Amino acid sequence: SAAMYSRFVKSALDDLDKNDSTQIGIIANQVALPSKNPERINDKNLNILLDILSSNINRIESSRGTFLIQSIINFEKWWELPPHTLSKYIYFIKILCSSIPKWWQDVSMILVSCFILPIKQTVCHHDMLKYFLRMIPSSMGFIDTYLAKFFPNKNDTRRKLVNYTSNLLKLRGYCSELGFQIWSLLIEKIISIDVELQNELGIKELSTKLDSILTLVSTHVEEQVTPESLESGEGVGVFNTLTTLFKTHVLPTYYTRSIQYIMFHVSQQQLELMDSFLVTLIDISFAVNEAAEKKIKSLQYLGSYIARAKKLSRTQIIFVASYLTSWLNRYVIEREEEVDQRGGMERFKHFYAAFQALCYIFCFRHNIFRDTDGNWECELDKFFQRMVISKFNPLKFCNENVMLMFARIAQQESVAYCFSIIENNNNERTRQQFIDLQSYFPYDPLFLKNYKILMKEYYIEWS
Amino acid sequence: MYKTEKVDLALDPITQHFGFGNDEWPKEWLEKLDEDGLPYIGTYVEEGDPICAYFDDTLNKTKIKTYHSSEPAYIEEVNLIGDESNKFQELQTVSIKYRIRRTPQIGDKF
Amino acid sequence: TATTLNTPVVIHATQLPQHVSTDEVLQFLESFIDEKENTNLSSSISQLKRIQRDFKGLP
Amino acid sequence: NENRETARFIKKHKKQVTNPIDEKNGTSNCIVRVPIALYVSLAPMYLENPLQGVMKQHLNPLVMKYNNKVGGVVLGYEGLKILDADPLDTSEKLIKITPDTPFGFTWCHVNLYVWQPQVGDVLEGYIFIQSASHIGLLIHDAFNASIKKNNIPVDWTFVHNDVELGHWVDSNGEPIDGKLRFTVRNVHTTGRVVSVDGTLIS
Amino acid sequence: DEITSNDRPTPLANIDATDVEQIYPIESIIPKKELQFIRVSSILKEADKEKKLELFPYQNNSKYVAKKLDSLTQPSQMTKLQLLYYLSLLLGVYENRRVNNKTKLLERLNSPPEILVDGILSRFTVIKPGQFGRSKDRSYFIDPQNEDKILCYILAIIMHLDNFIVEITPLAHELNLKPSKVVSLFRVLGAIVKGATVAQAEAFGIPKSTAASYKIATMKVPFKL
Amino acid sequence: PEDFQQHEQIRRKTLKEKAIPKDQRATTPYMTKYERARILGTRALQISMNAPVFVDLEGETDPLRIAMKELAEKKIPLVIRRYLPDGSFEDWSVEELIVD
Amino acid sequence: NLSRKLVKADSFFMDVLVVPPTRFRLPSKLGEEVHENSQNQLLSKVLTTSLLIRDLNDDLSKLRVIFSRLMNAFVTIQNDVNAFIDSTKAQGRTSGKVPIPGVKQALEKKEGLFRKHMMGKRVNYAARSVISPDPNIETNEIGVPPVFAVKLTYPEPVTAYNIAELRQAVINGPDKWPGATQIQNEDGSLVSLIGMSVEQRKALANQLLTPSSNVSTHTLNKKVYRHIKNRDVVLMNRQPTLHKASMMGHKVRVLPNEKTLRLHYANTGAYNADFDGDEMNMHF
Amino acid sequence: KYICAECSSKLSLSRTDAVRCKDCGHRILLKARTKRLVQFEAR
Amino acid sequence: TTCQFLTKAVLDNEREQLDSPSARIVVGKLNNVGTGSFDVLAKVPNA
Amino acid sequence: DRLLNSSDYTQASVCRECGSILTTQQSVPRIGSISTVCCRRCSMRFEDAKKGEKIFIDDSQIWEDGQGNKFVGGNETTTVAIPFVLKYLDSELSAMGIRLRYNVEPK
Amino acid sequence: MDISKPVGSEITSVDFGILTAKEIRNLSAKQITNPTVLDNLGHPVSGGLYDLALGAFLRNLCSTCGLDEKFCPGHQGHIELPVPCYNPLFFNQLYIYL
Ligand SMILES: [Zn+2]
Ligand SMILES: [Zn+2]
Ligand SMILES: [Zn+2]
């Protein structure tokens, strides 16, 4: 009957040139049933069909040829095949839609939507993709509405969603020179679980899914940024747009705390790539025509980027940030003749924060703040002494938690004297919500139990 | 002040029926309706509250007639009007009286 | 899409299409590309460096 | 009132530039420079660098596509001019702001490359990857082409695989290297990425 | 409002035959091509009504499909069983009159042949032309032309399956209509409404006391010229 | 291209012919109130669209109130046209205009 | 004449009477009875007068009183088009209280089309209210009830400038102290909050400042529509005024009290006001 | 619980009833109160 | 009399700059008889 | 903000070279076609595609209408800040017997 | 009117005209000649006074624009008179020129 089926599929293609075309549409209603039913198309009848249709294969594009292409590519759940039928069917994707941007456009609609599937079901879901990312230059046009399209929300069940978050690191690892598109969904969607998290600080579903992102993404991307690809591979191109992309989806949202852990882990592993991010924190707040609240948080990204870590060139921490200690000299020479003019005290958000952020280094690393000889680092007996009774009172408008850790170490280590001033504070002592930006510290202590696997590495306890 | 509302039905055999039939109407508005489809006497109507949840005939469903005014008031009287007719019909006209409790607030007139 | 913020409102041509040969623009596309790094600007770099090899290179 | 109206049939349908064969090397010349008066709208964020700030406004999302008025698939810009409303050259200059919104105007004219499709002209083909009801024809390895069943020759013939893309057989039976031929009959504008649709009788 | 002339939903009918069963063809309704593309060789392998109304594409709530299902169980009566799949789509468009696409409608019918579908959509629905459906399938709409166009395939089936009688109240009310809607609708093909005769009074179970209000509709001969 | 340039150099000469430079200035040289009812709010919705600011605002989260903190300080980058209503305009700027 | 157009007689004859579109003839339901547009009643008078005289050339050319079927109906063919436009002169109507208004009479009702639709428009974002006098207002404030401090909202963008006060509008919403009712996005969405909970009030305030997914709208930002403040202006004007100094703007301070509007003492000289029932508007 | 309006002739009628007062020919029917734990206003 | 003031207006077939606010706002435009009797230009740094 | 921004602002669309708002369309497109916006008055029917040889049409003027036909012409039209009442008006006065034309400033 | 939506053009002026038979060719989509507007049964008749080819009446799809009534303006139509008649507007002007 195999020779009886081969003439049943050869007598179809004739009479479309005789404008009858009888036996065409009968088969295409069979290739759309599920695999739940034995009366569909099977192994033997398809590869015989996919060669007899390929006799003179210029026979698709006519007025009747939309009903044929769809359900062949819509062979639903197409990973149920032995390795003999699997050959010519994958070849038929390589012949049907090799140049027409109309149904190959409906192929990457399938191959991206079938990346929600587990990785051992995607043995060829991305190897089909990687071949045309090195051969075809311009098939990037009609996939540019296919990345954020196939992001469902959490109304779908758990295992389809977060497995899709890992399936595109295979795909990006061979498509390296492009750089920026693949992130542009997964940069936005760190915030969406995080937005529903700090206002919850239905909540248990944020536990293991965040375990399914934090240990997942910050390990395989950590194996992307690697010392074996510093100056020979594509590693310099990684850093070029993971600063401005961090600047436009961590800085514009406030009180949203699970997102500053992207570059908090892969460049603390080394010496230079932290210091590549040490110049990143410099250029932000130090211009004129920038945003309004850019002076506070960006230099607050220097507070626990220095304190709670372990791998720092600490001979460079005083050296590179010497301009901020030279700011403290520049702030007292040129900029203390303006206070009795029109205005209050709150012109200087740069002053209660970056001075606080360097004093956020104070209570945590006191053995760094001493040398071998016996003096103080940069003469602490005058430098943090000159700023007491000036026209701002930097012991008046302060924080609660860290700015009242100023009471233990200042006396027993003989740092400062403010114990007769604390009673004198609360007599003299928009703007009502100005405290909302000056209360949160960026790199807080870690609360989770299974991402602490990665980040107890360069994180020390209180001493 | 009073606002005597009414309910007129379909401006043929009679095919509009007060009360409930046999479908399942969505509950939690037990709090205003007796099962005869007429409401209580003396409860606090708002906007977002049925008045005459009656049973249709064209789908055999229960439709619900909520409150079309602002006026958060109470509900007072229920009259039942039909036709004296020798081929007598089931009653199809209810004239329900409200009484709205008007405290003298500032901006009134003496 | 396709509004006044997405599309320029009125477009017209200045003059006749001053023509260049096919090999003429091979000297004059490099200034369109190399001024980039001193979504769409990602796909403005990789696909246009693969049409270099139409008349200049070979894969 | 018969012959007077009929003059406008051509001046809004004249082929602006037709092109003959090029160099006798298989290809043809349809890459060309056109200055155009791009009446653009501003970027109120970017009133400190409109040399870049309006370039990201209607010009980088203008690339690699076709339009209505230039009659060609635009490809690339050069020579950013911006124009003013004064007898002023000058470094700093004025922009007319809209009287309703910060999105201002400027009636600037800048100079564009464009690709154009002409009719009945030969064009290059590369064996890039071969299709089922298409022969693989990557014009400048960038955009795609199209054929039909009704415009293939007789000696053009096919063989499908036997042991383990698709074999094509010429007039005698030997495959060749990459260079292919294609002529133009029609165009199809409104896909996602544009392409042309032709015949092979030349 | 119709490619059929002048508001009557009657296609090319017949009044000029001799056979009783051949007074009106369903080829006027369902054409030759879709009528012969039914894999019908698996229906009467089973016999029980639980194993018949549970593998069809559509399952209704009422017995309005199966009100004549026991009148055909033998496979000698397969010609009207092709109409019983059409029974399964007699209501296949009107109780989903609100929605008018197809892939959402694919979850209404568990795997039917799509070639059986688009003879009703192309004529009896008024199409919304939209290419947002056309990559999938053919979207449509039902206008207010379509209220009395949707019953004549009961006046040639429910008439046809019981030797050409139709009673009012198991038809005017199982279709949820008032029995005065049909008197101005009886004469749209050539049907005749008539009272209670002397022999066929037992076909519903009525006495003679309401026989002037007991009104029947049937077909015996070709329509009176 | 043919009568495009008929509408390209008919405007570059009817802008010479309709202009008046600062030498033939004839209008009142004050920053007046309709001007003050204009260039604030013309910058104020412009500064609302994340436009750059030069002077440190005192946290005063109103788009209108920043520009009056600029108007009496003159870091206001706007230029005013003024119509003489029979086919001639006159130009100004804010650096050479002084406030009532 | 820059185009050099001939004038022709064919324009001054009515060949067509172009019929107005669907959206401009729409029959609504009003009263006990319902019937369609009174324009279509003029049109459906012409057609069956046209199509009566249209089908007479059948009765002469496909070959007496039959000639009077056209001439003494041409006086009604004349009377077709005119009463569509202008009904000053039609056949003698008895006192039936109304002849039908076609277009020009149907423009101007009590000669008020431009006077109520084109020029004198009915306006959104209003408030009509009874006035009250109250102190402690320096002649350009208006004390307002919170029920006008929750209804009339104000469009205002987010920036890297309006976050700290503006997230307070989002977290209240339409509940209380002025909040945020219709949050929009980079494309023009309408994300309401009139039923969204305080979980969705703390959520969206951590969301509002985000660059667009489409980089074709790369510069825009979301517009949090806050209600009203101590920092915006209410314009107010009296209805029968007949002078210039009546459209006097004021700012507003929220005033937790009953439901009326509070004029200041001294301001009654401009508006020619009483308090014997008189009451004036409020705009925004 | 439907008190008539003719002579307070108390009846408790259901649906599908022939409406008349039950001594003479009057139609109009009121409705009576039922105890409900409902919170009411007092200032 | 705008019924009768178009027999003297359409018949002439004029060109109106419609600059009075009884014609300026009927198309929707900023007024020449007030605080928008002109527009604003904008200084930009460089070409 | 008062007399135009009540609710009457829109981005109405005006065919230039005849000057109307009621005439243009957002046409129901072809199979792949997106944002098919054109006019009908400045266009003409493809049954009049005849004639110098016959010129090959350039596919930017083949576009499907609503009834199912195919006609050719009258392409470019932008969005103009117009009240709907004016868009009501130029069809109110077209019916009484006055033809109307508008124009714009960018040509 | 929102700041987030710009507009790239304006309106300058007005122009008048008078109805000629030449401009009836391309002004519409379908004739209107049948007298009544919709019969029984609820449908608006096609080629009718509430045609769908003249706008979109009563939540039907618009057979000119293909999308719903939230995006349909409604289109121009036209009668054809039996004889070309007067315009009583202009009866005060070309009475005398005649
Ligand atoms: Zn009694
Ligand atoms: Zn036009
Ligand atoms: Zn339409």
Author numbering:
A (entry chain O): 48 to 248, 324 to 551, 581 to 614
B (entry chain B): 803 to 813, 819 to 917
C (entry chain D): 12 to 49, 80 to 100
D (entry chain G): 8 to 95, 99 to 174, 214 to 251
E (entry chain M): 179 to 403
F (entry chain F): 55 to 154
G (entry chain A): 344 to 406, 417 to 637
H (entry chain L): 28 to 70
The study reports:
Transcription of pre-ribosomal RNA initiates by binding of RNA polymerase I (Pol I) to Rrn3, which stabilizes its monomeric form. Subsequently, Pol I and Rrn3 are recruited to the core promoter by the upstream activating factor (UAF), TATA-binding protein (TBP) and core factor to form the Pol I pre-initiation complex (PIC). Here, we present cryo-electron microscopy (cryo-EM) reconstructions of several Pol I ICs, including two CCs, two spontaneously formed OC intermediates and two OCs varying between 2.7 to 3.7 Å resolution. Together, the different reconstructions provide mechanistic insights into complex assembly, allow following template and non-template DNA strand paths, show the necessary conformational changes during promoter opening and reveal the interplay between Rrn3 and A49 tWH in promoter escape.
We obtained an independent reconstruction of the Pol I-Rrn3-DNA complex from the OC dataset lacking the CF where the A49 tWH is observed in the same position as in the Pol I EC complex. The movement of the A49 tWH towards the stalk appears to destabilize the interaction of Rrn3 with Pol I subunit A43 by pushing the Rrn3 N-terminal region away from the stalk. It was previously suggested that A49 is involved in the release of Rrn3 during the early phase of elongation. However, no mechanistic insight of how A49 could regulate the release of Rrn3 was available. Our results thus provide structural evidence that rationalize the previous observations on the role of the A49 tWH in promoter opening and Rrn3 dissociation. Further transition to the EC requires a slight movement of the upstream DNA that would collide with A49 tWH in the initiation position. As a result, the A49 tWH moves to its elongation position, where it displaces the N-terminal region of Rrn3 to further destabilize Rrn3 binding to Pol I.
